[PDB]
Design an enzyme around this catalytic site. Structure first.
Site, PDB file in Angstrom:
ATOM      1  CG  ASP A  63     -37.663 -92.217  53.742  1.00  0.00           C
ATOM      2  OD1 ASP A  63     -36.233 -92.064  53.724  1.00  0.00           O
ATOM      3  OD2 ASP A  63     -38.031 -93.039  54.137  1.00  0.00           O
ATOM      4  CB  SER A 111     -42.445 -92.807  58.350  1.00  0.00           C
ATOM      5  OG  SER A 111     -43.019 -93.363  57.224  1.00  0.00           O
TER       6      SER A 111
END
Length: 291
Positions: free
Chosen positions: A127, A18
């Site tokens: 995630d 990310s």
């Protein structure tokens, strides 16, 4: 030599998560190898400082990596973290992409506890995927760590435990392969969605691949929608057929949680713990990669 923090030799790029890239680094002082996350500062919505604060809130947790240093140098925000061992995806490949039931169950127990811990600190991870779990080093080689809080979001207020409101048209966040069905539908994620994703991860370990993997597609929009529509059209009872019924129970339990429900984590752990005992496994922490 190129250094960050005037203490960390920067090495090769080793992945991208990310909002930033991950590099090998060496604590030039301690002499230990570290992981270094870099975020280009040229942005109106920087994230690495926010992520760092989430980690630092987490460090009372078992299986949360230590943050060594946070700062800004030149064009980059910098976060240095303890370097751990291989990811569960790495170990999955070392084990030629099949895990035994016992390894999956040993993993399942710790992975539920990591997620529960994050939720107890008022965040959802968003995630959940094998690459975001890493084994520790040395005498912590039996311990599963969870990493990457760049997609994490607070789901409730710390004081009142008031849950974030129900909302739709939220964009997809992490990987499509492990996303919850509600996430495909654009529904705001909550605690149930972290756990449903873990359910897909566990079935991925059991099966070697998920049935919505490797669907033939020319363009890359048509590969996502085939993932979404195969995942939505494949019942849990079909997905988990030939495997212990606990895995189907786990996924059904997670899919049936209400948006703001507190998951009964203990019941989910006991599901797998009781199966562990029925198979006559022992807690010697001998995973597939230890053989």
């Amino acid at each position: 030599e190129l250094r960050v923090g005037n203490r960390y030799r920067l090495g090769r790029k080793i992945g991208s998560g990310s909002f930033g890239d991950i590099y090998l680094g060496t604590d030039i002082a301690a002499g230990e190898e570290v992981a270094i996350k870099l975020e280009c500062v040229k942005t109106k919505h920087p994230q690495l400082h926010i992520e760092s604060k989430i980690y630092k809130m987490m460090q009372g947790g078992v299986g949360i990596p230590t943050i060594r240093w946070c700062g800004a140098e030149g064009d980059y925000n910098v976060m240095v973290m303890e370097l751990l061992g291989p990811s569960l995806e790495d170990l999955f490949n070392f084990c030629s992409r099949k895990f035994s039931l016992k390894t999956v169950l040993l993993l399942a127990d710790q992975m539920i506890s990591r997620i529960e811990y994050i939720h107890s600190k008022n965040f959802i991870h968003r995630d959940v995927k094998p690459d975001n779990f890493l084994m520790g080093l040395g005498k912590k080689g039996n311990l599963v760590y969870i990493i990457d809080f760049g997609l994490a979001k607070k789901y409730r207020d710390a004081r009142t435990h008031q849950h974030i409101p129900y909302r739709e048209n939220k964009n997809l966040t992490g990987t499509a392969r492990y996303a919850s069905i509600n996430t495909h539908l654009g529904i705001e994620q909550s605690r149930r969605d972290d756990l449903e994703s873990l359910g897909y991860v566990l079935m991925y370990f059991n099966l070697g691949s998920l049935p919505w993997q490797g669907l033939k597609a020319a363009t890359k929009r048509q590969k996502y929608e085939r993932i979404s529509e195969k995942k939505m059209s494949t019942p849990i009872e079909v997905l988990c057929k030939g495997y212990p019924s606990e895995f189907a129970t786990y996924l059904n339990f997670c899919r049936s949680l209400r948006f703001d429900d507190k998951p009964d984590y203990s019941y989910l752990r006991q599901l797998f713990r009781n199966l562990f005992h029925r198979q006559g496994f022992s807690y010697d922490y001998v995973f597939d990669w230890n053989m």
